[PDB]
């Protein structure tokens, strides 16, 4: 009944990004959020340098129209600090700092070498081939603003400014547990209707790959005392508390009252598939996210709901939800109007090199294989009905969490 | 001069994937390559259960034709217990175990639920709507073959089988260093023709994000004895040695002779842009990859050549290279025949909800900004010339290394 979009916006609207920060060497900053703007302590380039390989000359020396001999050479790591007499030019390479008095640089193309010096074939105007210092980055300028997630694209640049460490927002702490006498750990036989806990591992892995600091409390016994203790512990040491399954997501039971008791939790019924129920609210010192017990549902819900909540909490200002694109289906998709169906598919190129999606197979939540077989979600509109081969469909490629 | 594909193909043909292994608890296996086939200890599902919400029936009872009174129900965690009188049906839900003797399940939508029984009119086929024990995974079957990179898609499935740990191939160890008197560390003012070492950090970051174990030896002093010692140290403890800059990639100097003295190293001239040079070869106990000093070229080269090399080395059997797709340029692209130009672009959805690339701006290798501003590579074919707006283009979306 409640739309995903409405649920998302309600959650996020309530959240305040972390501000706590720590300063780390750049090599430790991958995927981290800059806590403060990175302001350039220098100019890039530093010294006006040559745009190409050629000769640094003077407009007066060129005037003589006489083949002027090379008084010396200036290289990137070997700036020329020599004499540079009247009728002479300075051999230079790109990036190499331009010698004092330079007015322009000429490429070795518009230049011909004679026994009495370089003879300039073309015209030479001031500024020519000279990279103006600080033209790419001026000292005192903001290179990267606070909120930027540091990547291989940004970190090397910060290093290029001679900066060793930058301040980053601390990692989001996420407490995680599951509960239910039916949940069993590996190596232990499956009791009556016991199953192996899988949601907890799934969430744990995703949290870690999202750069969160995970506090896994494991499986909490179906006991008010154990559950309440877990909640109090989690809430006291993390920013987000997640029940990977076992805690009520609507149905009344002792877990639900502990919930109602420790915070203001809403029990949503989302117009999505797979899944539907999702618990969310403020605990005393944390945000709580309760996932349905079904593995496919829990994974999907986490991916479409908790992930963007964590993104906001992190301080990341990269406003937006994962890229989606219109694509044709090579597959017939069964779809019931009424729910935004996040089916799984395989995005691939057809003979003509165009992208297309095929179903992974059965879309039931009784199996998990679709996550491995697939590489994307086929996000079928809420009101949409069955999809025939060739129809335009919205596709959202899986992120790194699924490979 | 030499084609990227040819270079890459040749590099990969010489490499043998690591085999050394370690057994780790599933939570520590993200991104890791399965060392041995994961065999299923159980049947999935574990018992015959219903594919739908409906009624469990017997072919003979339907054959009788009279409405079938509901004798009971079987749900999720509670199979149907007690006798199943003849001429009756058991109410059932998806996933619930099918009652003893059940030969078929009929979806409620095909039935007329009346006060004195359920009227069945549709033909009923034996086995219909019954999910048989082990139809998804049968005990003794390989669930994931050795070579599989473990993700949130695979790990939870392994957990569901009650398996706590799996054998994964050890991380590829990569020794990293750069050299040159110009190279400066952060915090220290730039000397004569000095610059801040940025390639090393870049490579380090990627290596780590690629799951490799990095041995960063730092900046080696411009000395043959120091360099020689560096190689020895690097080669003795790593599977791969990478010079992020400073060691010769073709040009003769003291570094090139050390290279020639410590192993069989090829100095390639790649028909690509940016970049061109790349040193590759077998050292005594490792593979060596030497990158050009230009930041843009080094990153690109690492990205398009070293990354794939590391992937094969890891034992990952996932065949293929980064995903590419045909897209229209919303930008005119300056392209020169001769080199495979990996320009940086911005792939985004247009008004018509269609995907399209825009150049990030100046494509020169003197600036690093294009990696931050872009989100993809516009892979302009070697022979291709200038590209006019609206032309079909190859795009390779950036992977996580750049966000």
Curated annotation (Swiss-Prot), chains A, B:
Swiss-Prot/TrEMBL keywords: Magnesium, Metal-binding, Molybdenum, Molybdenum cofactor biosynthesis, Transferase
GO terms of biological process kind: Mo-molybdopterin cofactor biosynthetic process
One GO location term (cellular component): cytoplasm
KW Transferase (keyword) present: yes
EC number(s) per entry: 2.10.1.1
PROSITE patterns xrefs: MOCF_BIOSYNTHESIS_2 (PS01079)
Annotated pathway: Cofactor biosynthesis; molybdopterin biosynthesis
SMART domains: MoCF_biosynth
Gene Ontology MF, one: molybdopterin molybdotransferase activity
Pfam families: MoCF_biosynth, MoeA_C, MoeA_N
Catalytic reactions of this protein: adenylyl-molybdopterin + molybdate = Mo-molybdopterin + AMP + H(+)
Cofactor: Mg(2+)
Cofactor: how bound: Binds 1 Mg(2+) ion per subunit.
Family: Belongs to the MoeA family.
Function, as annotated: Catalyzes the insertion of molybdate into adenylated molybdopterin with the concomitant release of AMP.
NCBIfam families xrefs: Glp_gephyrin, molyb_syn, PRK10680.1
Subunit record text: Homodimer. Interacts with MobA, MogA and MobB in vivo.
Name of this protein: Molybdopterin molybdenumtransferase
Organism: Escherichia coli (strain K12)
């Amino acid at each position: 009944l409640m739309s995903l979009d409405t649920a998302l916006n309600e959650m996020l609207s309530r959240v305040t990004p972390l501000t706590a920060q720590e300063t780390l060497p750049l090599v430790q900053c991958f995927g981290r959020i800059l806590a403060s703007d990175v302001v350039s302590p220098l100019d890039v380039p530093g010294f006006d340098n040559s745009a190409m390989d050629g000769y640094a000359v003077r407009l007066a020396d060129i005037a003589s129209g006489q083949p002027l001999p090379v008084a010396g050479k200036s290289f990137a790591g070997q700036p020329y600090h020599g004499e540079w007499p009247a009728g002479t030019c300075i051999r230079i390479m790109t990036g190499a700092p331009v010698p004092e008095g330079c007015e322009a640089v000429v490429m070795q193309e518009q230049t011909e070498q004679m026994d009495n010096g370089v003879r300039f074939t073309a015209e030479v105007r001031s500024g020519q081939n000279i990279r103006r210092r600080g033209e790419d980055i001026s000292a005192g300028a903001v290179v990267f603003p606070a909120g930027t997630r540091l990547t291989t694209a940004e970190l090397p640049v910060i290093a290029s400014l001679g900066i060793a460490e930058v301040p980053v927002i601390r990692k989001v702490r996420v407490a995680l547990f599951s509960t239910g006498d039916e949940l069993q750990l590996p190596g232990q036989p499956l009791g009556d209707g016991q199953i192996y806990d899988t949601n907890r591992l799934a969430v744990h892995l995703m949290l870690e790959q999202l750069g969160c600091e995970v506090i896994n409390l494991g499986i909490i016994r179906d006991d008010p005392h154990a559950l309440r203790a877990a909640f109090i512990e989690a809430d006291s040491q993390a920013d987000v508390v997640i029940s990977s399954g076992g805690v009520s997501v609507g149905e009344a039971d002792y877990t639900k009252t502990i919930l109602e008791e420790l915070g203001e939790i809403a029990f949503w019924k989302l117009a999505i598939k797979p899944g539907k129920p999702f618990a969310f609210g403020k605990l005393s010192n944390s945000w709580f996210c309760g996932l349905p017990g079904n593995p496919v549902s829990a994974t999907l819900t986490f991916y479409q709901l908790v992930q963007p909540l964590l993104a906001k909490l992190s301080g990341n200002t990269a406003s937006g939800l994962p890229a989606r694109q219109r694509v044709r289906t090579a597959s017939r998709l069964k779809k019931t109007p009424g729910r935004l169906d996040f089916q799984r598919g395989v995005l691939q190129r057809n003979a003509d090199g165009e992208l297309e999606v095929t179903t992974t197979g059965h879309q039931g939540s009784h199996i998990f294989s679709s996550f491995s077989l697939g590489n994307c979600f086929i996000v079928l509109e809420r009101d949409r009905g069955n999809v025939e081969v060739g129809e335009w469909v919205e596709v959202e490629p899986f992120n790194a969490l699924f490979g």
